[PDB]
Amino acid sequence: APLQLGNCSVAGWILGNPECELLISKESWSYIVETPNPENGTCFPGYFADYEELRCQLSSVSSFERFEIFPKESSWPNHTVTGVSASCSHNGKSSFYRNLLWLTGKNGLYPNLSKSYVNNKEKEVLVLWGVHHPPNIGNQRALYHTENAYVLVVSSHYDRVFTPIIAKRPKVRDQEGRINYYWTLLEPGDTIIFEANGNLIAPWYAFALSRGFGSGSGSCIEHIENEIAELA
Amino acid sequence: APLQLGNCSVAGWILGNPECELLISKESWSYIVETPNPENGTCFPGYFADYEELRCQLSSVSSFERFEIFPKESSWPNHTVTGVSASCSHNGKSSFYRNLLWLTGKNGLYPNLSKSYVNNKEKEVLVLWGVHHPPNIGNQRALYHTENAYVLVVSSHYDRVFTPIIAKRPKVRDQEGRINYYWTLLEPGDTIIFEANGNLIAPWYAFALSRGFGSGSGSCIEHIENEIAELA
Amino acid sequence: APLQLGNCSVAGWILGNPECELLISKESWSYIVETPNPENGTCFPGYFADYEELRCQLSSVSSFERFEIFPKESSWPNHTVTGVSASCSHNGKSSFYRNLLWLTGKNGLYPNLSKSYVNNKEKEVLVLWGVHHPPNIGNQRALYHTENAYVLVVSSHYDRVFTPIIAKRPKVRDQEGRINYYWTLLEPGDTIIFEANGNLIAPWYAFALSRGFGSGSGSCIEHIENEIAELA
Ligand SMILES: *[C@@H]1O[C@H](CO)[C@@H](O)[C@H](O)[C@H]1NC(C)=O
Ligand SMILES: *[C@@H]1O[C@H](CO)[C@@H](O)[C@H](O)[C@H]1NC(C)=O
Ligand SMILES: *[C@@H]1O[C@H](CO)[C@@H](O)[C@H](O)[C@H]1NC(C)=O
Ligand SMILES: *[C@@H]1O[C@H](CO)[C@@H](O)[C@H](O)[C@H]1NC(C)=O
Ligand SMILES: *[C@@H]1O[C@H](CO)[C@@H](O)[C@H](O)[C@H]1NC(C)=O
Ligand SMILES: *[C@@H]1O[C@H](CO)[C@@H](O)[C@H](O)[C@H]1NC(C)=O
Numbered sequence: 200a201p202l203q204l205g206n207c208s209v210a211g212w213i214l215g216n217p218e219c220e221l222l223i224s225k226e227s228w229s230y231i232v233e234t235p236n237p238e239n240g241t242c243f244p245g246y247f248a249d250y251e252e253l254r255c256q257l258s259s260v261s262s263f264e265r266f267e268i269f270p271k272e273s274s275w276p277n278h279t280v281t282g283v284s285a286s287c288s289h290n291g292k293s294s295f296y297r298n299l300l301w302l303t304g305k306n307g308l309y310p311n312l313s314k315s316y317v318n319n320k321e322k323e324v325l326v327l328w329g330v331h332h333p334p335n336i337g338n339q340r341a342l343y344h345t346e347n348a349y350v351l352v353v354s355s356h357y358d359r360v361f362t363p364i365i366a367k368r369p370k371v372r373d374q375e376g377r378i379n380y381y382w383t384l385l386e387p388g389d390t391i392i393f394e395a396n397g398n399l400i401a402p403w404y405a406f407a408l409s410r411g412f413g414s415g416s417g418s419c420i421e422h423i424e425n426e427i428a429e430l431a
Numbered sequence: 432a433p434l435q436l437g438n439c440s441v442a443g444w445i446l447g448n449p450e451c452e453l454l455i456s457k458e459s460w461s462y463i464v465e466t467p468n469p470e471n472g473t474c475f476p477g478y479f480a481d482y483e484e485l486r487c488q489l490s491s492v493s494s495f496e497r498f499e500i501f502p503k504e505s506s507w508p509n510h511t512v513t514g515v516s517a518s519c520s521h522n523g524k525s526s527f528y529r530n531l532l533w534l535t536g537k538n539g540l541y542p543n544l545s546k547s548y549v550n551n552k553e554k555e556v557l558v559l560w561g562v563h564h565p566p567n568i569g570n571q572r573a574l575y576h577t578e579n580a581y582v583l584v585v586s587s588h589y590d591r592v593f594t595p596i597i598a599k600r601p602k603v604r605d606q607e608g609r610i611n612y613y614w615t616l617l618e619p620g621d622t623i624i625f626e627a628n629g630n631l632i633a634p635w636y637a638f639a640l641s642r643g644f645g646s647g648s649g650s651c652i653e654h655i656e657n658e659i660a661e662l663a
Numbered sequence: 664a665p666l667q668l669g670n671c672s673v674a675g676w677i678l679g680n681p682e683c684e685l686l687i688s689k690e691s692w693s694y695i696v697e698t699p700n701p702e703n704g705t706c707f708p709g710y711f712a713d714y715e716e717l718r719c720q721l722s723s724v725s726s727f728e729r730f731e732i733f734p735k736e737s738s739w740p741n742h743t744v745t746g747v748s749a750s751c752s753h754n755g756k757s758s759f760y761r762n763l764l765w766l767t768g769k770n771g772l773y774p775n776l777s778k779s780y781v782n783n784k785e786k787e788v789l790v791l792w793g794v795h796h797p798p799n800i801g802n803q804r805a806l807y808h809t810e811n812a813y814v815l816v817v818s819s820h821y822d823r824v825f826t827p828i829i830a831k832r833p834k835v836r837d838q839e840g841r842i843n844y845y846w847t848l849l850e851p852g853d854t855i856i857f858e859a860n861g862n863l864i865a866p867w868y869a870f871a872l873s874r875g876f877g878s879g880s881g882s883c884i885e886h887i888e889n890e891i892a893e894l895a
């Protein structure tokens with residue numbers, strides 16, 4: 200039972216690109232069907248880290264659930280949660296991915312961010328977030344009132360620090376700057392911790408994946424050895 | 432002739448996890464047998480770099496030898512070589528991997544470390560080392576008497592610098608901090624150089640691998656093309 | 664129709680190692696034939712990034728064209744374009760890769776470099792460049808009159824900053840220092856931007872690749888699923 204998907208890419212589907220009306224009551228799947236030359240992927244162009252592995256850790260999924268992880272109403276009273284960009288306009292209305300929140304400062308200097316989530320779903324949780332990369336220091340200051348910020352993400356098995364690189368690139372969809380996307384799988388019983396002083400796009404929704412026994416570690420090269428074994 | 436292994440992972444076996452009584456007169460093997468859901472892997476939880484490739488560069492091995500590379504008695508007269516952690520307790524006794532030495536300072540400021548080894552085994556040598564990542568600056572100071580240190584590893588074909596990131600993670604096996612593992616293959620005739628001013632877990636033992644003709648470059652994706660060729 | 668290649672590696676061929684007389688009227692190919700234990704690869708030893716993927720993005724190619732991207736005569740009036748090294752000596756004459764230019768300063772402090780190229784070939788363009796890593800600060804100063812420099816490379820889909828690490832390694836081909844190689848595929852209509860204040864080896868020639876329909880994204884793991892599908 201292959202999952203049916205339109206003119207969108209997996210990145211668009213998982214990030215929550217408004218242009219993709221994929222919000223349907225679909226649970227498990229054996230395959231993902233994707234247009235070989237998709238258009239509706241990332242609203243704000245940029246690099247999607249480990250994109251190949253995310254089409255291998257979701258190549259076969261059992262029970263699949265979308266749930267809210269960090270509600271905008273209560274999670275960030277001291278920050279702006281309306282980082283809307285006309286980069287894309289569903290119904291001609293500027294909007295952002297429906298699973299992410301682009302946070303900015305207000306009144307004074309961007310207040311420090313310290314939040315965490317504990318996985319009590321009894322399933323592995325896929326958490327997605329981004330890092331903002333301004334085209335200019337003046338724009339970085341406009342959003343965060345600083346010229347120097349970092350994003351740190353910590354879990355039991357994954358730990359990385361992200362540094363924003365300010366530089367102007369060729370315009371893509373009229374964007375001079377760029378957003379990079381990162382993700383990790385949070386094991387049951389663990390905690391994901393986010394710490395930042397600016398240039399953070401926070402997770403809003405997260406996905407719980409049963410996975411089942413359709414794969415091994417899920418990583419690619421582990422979805423081939425099994426395919427070869429099946430032929431042999 | 433598959434290699435028999437208990438409830439341990441390859442990481443545990445190669446690092447020297449005391450809980451794994453795998454110290455047997457075993458040389459060559461055609462396969463590695465590993466429990467699909469292993470428990471006895473890394474004593475001090477953390478990230479193991481390039482773990483998939485180390486189960487592909489050792490997927491098929493001819494002559495295999497464990498030898499001492501940097502003896503604790505003579506290699507570090509100016510450092511502590513007893514970085515024991517109760518993280519694990521063989522016979523209920525706190526101990527560390529039997530192939531690695533966690534070095535710390537003594538008396539004064541952690542003395543600078545400059546050591547090297549020349550490969551004269553006529554075989555490729557697998558060298559493993561780690562980098563310490565404190566949960567707090569106070570703990571970094573307790574061990575090294577500094578708040579700023581780096582680890583540099585240089586060879587003919589591999590050259591990387593490691594920077595420790597101090598941050599507290601969720602406790603794993605009661606550990607607030609974390610150790611990352613790195614490795615490289617040193618070609619015959621080359622030299623591996625270690626330079627550091629703190630936060631280093633030095634290699635103690637190293638492995639000489641004949642490898643033979645059971646693989647190509649050894650890298651994965653090079654252990655599949657050959658498998659497909661065999662089917663075809 | 665496999666491409667015939669001598670005692671050289673792909674890295675040597677694409678970089679332009681003088682010792683490799685592969686400058687022939689060869690266009691498309693279905694396979695690349697390479698000596699399993701090649702000798703004539705990189706003149707100045709060092710690390711070649713993403714080398715496996717460059718033997719998978721060129722595993723099958725249709726029309727293939729070598730063209731000049733940044734002519735030495737007009738592109739750098741304020742820099743030295745004769746960074747010759749005796750590392751190798753075709754006809755016993757010190758020379759450098761015939762697709763790269765090792766730039767150095769002159770008279771005063773290495774002038775800042777800002778250059779770009781727009782892809783109007785209607786084909787994907789493969790751009791190669793390098794980063795210099797001195798064995799000593801004194802040598803870095805001799806070439807660039809500085810002790811601190813960086814290289815930044817920006818495109819629509821790729822954006823990375825390179826930091827040189829000064830350290831002495833074991834001599835390889837009598838070289839105490841080392842050069843690392845990096846590359847990216849520039850899509851039609853995009854622009855590649857190079858910005859640096861030292862330690863840059865600039866692209867001189869670039870390749871236009873038709874590619875055709877002999878592969879998918881071209882990435883490895885995407886050249887295997889197709890091979891397995893063919894068997895099945
Ligand atoms: C994809 O685009 C084509 C052409 O506009 C359209 O006919 C098709 O319905 C689209 N797919 C979906 C799911 O809307
Ligand atoms: C979605 O794809 C259509 C082409 O069918 C394009 O016109 C539109 O701009 C795309 N929107 C986004 C957000 O990519
Ligand atoms: C917002 O700032 C006030 C200090 O003015 C602080 O007491 C409060 O806890 C902060 N709220 C959040 C969510 O950080
Ligand atoms: C966030 O906390 C760090 C110390 O951990 C501090 O140096 C930094 O200035 C704080 N951020 C802001 C905007 O004050
Ligand atoms: C692995 O664990 C099981 C269950 O305790 C035990 O019976 C088995 O002997 C263990 N394997 C080894 C090699 O000790
Ligand atoms: C080894 O595995 C056993 C479970 O059989 C567990 O109780 C013990 O704590 C583990 N020791 C280490 C060092 O992982």
Ligand SMILES: *[C@@H]1O[C@H](CO)[C@@H](O)[C@H](O)[C@H]1NC(C)=O
Binds near residue numbers: 506507508509542
């Ligand atoms: C230990 O320190 C002394 C200086 O007090 C130095 O002479 C000696 O060479 C050092 N030994 C090592 C192994 O670094």
Ligand SMILES: *[C@@H]1O[C@H](CO)[C@@H](O)[C@H](O)[C@H]1NC(C)=O
Binds near residue numbers: 540541542
């Ligand atoms: C190690 O040597 C470097 C210079 O290469 C020096 O800056 C550093 O302070 C030394 N380490 C210690 C603990 O003094």
Ligand SMILES: *[C@@H]1O[C@H](CO)[C@@H](O)[C@H](O)[C@H]1NC(C)=O
Binds near residue numbers: 668669670
């Ligand atoms: C490769 O080296 C061998 C041995 O010197 C030589 O005979 C052969 O002609 C070389 N290949 C090419 C293309 O020159």
Ligand SMILES: *[C@@H]1O[C@H](CO)[C@@H](O)[C@H](O)[C@H]1NC(C)=O
Binds near residue numbers: 702
């Ligand atoms: C090319 O290979 C030959 C061995 O046939 C070797 O003697 C020569 O030094 C190599 N030249 C380069 C630039 O690698």
Ligand SMILES: *[C@@H]1O[C@H](CO)[C@@H](O)[C@H](O)[C@H]1NC(C)=O
Binds near residue numbers: 741
């Ligand atoms: C060379 O330097 C002069 C300033 O003396 C500047 O006007 C000129 O544009 C520079 N040329 C290039 C190619 O950077």
Ligand SMILES: *[C@@H]1O[C@H](CO)[C@@H](O)[C@H](O)[C@H]1NC(C)=O
Binds near residue numbers: 774
């Ligand atoms: C290159 O420009 C930067 C500012 O973007 C400046 O800080 C740097 O010093 C310049 N390089 C040189 C050699 O002056």
